[PDB]
Amino acid sequence: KVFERCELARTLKRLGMDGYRGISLANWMCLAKWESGYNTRATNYNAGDRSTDYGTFQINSRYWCNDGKTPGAVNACHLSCSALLQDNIADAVACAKRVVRDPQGIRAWVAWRNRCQNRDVRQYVQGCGV
């Protein structure tokens, strides 16, 4: 499904993302906007290394979820990558939380560095009531 901005902002807040490991709600919103455009069924195959990115946060199959076809992959979130394509984002959020527990934090997604870091991200949550 494709979330509307404020709809997603409120959902993420309810799921405990605001300030999780020092990451503000607006940063998560900026990441979701640039990764999938708030689309839960988004998938991107990376032909260079045989991995695929799944769902709202475009979580990679080499380290986080298992899709069975990615070489030398681990499944740190202990989830089928299929779980990251559901309309209910509960699992994708649990897994995103795992991703940032690593040293890099939110920096794990290059898209965050390119389009969110050091920028004014207030706009992603303004008027949503979060």
Catalytic residue among 53, 67, 87, 91: 53
CATH code of the region 1-130 = 1.10.530.10
**Is 49 in the active site?**
no
Closest CA to 29 of 108, 102, 106: 106
Give the residue ranges of DSSP H helices in the chain.
5-14, 25-35, 90-99, 110-115
In contact, 8 and 124? CB cutoff 8 Å = no
Strand order across the 51-54 sheet: 43-46, 51-54, 59-60
Catalytic residue among 7, 35, 67, 91: 35
**Is 67 in the active site?**
no
Resolution of the PDB structure in angstroms = 1.8
In contact, 85 and 57? CB cutoff 8 Å = no
Single-letter amino acid code for the residue at 118: N
Please, which experimental method was used?
A: X-ray
Q: What is the DSSP letter of 99?
A: H
Give the domain ranges of the chain: 1-130
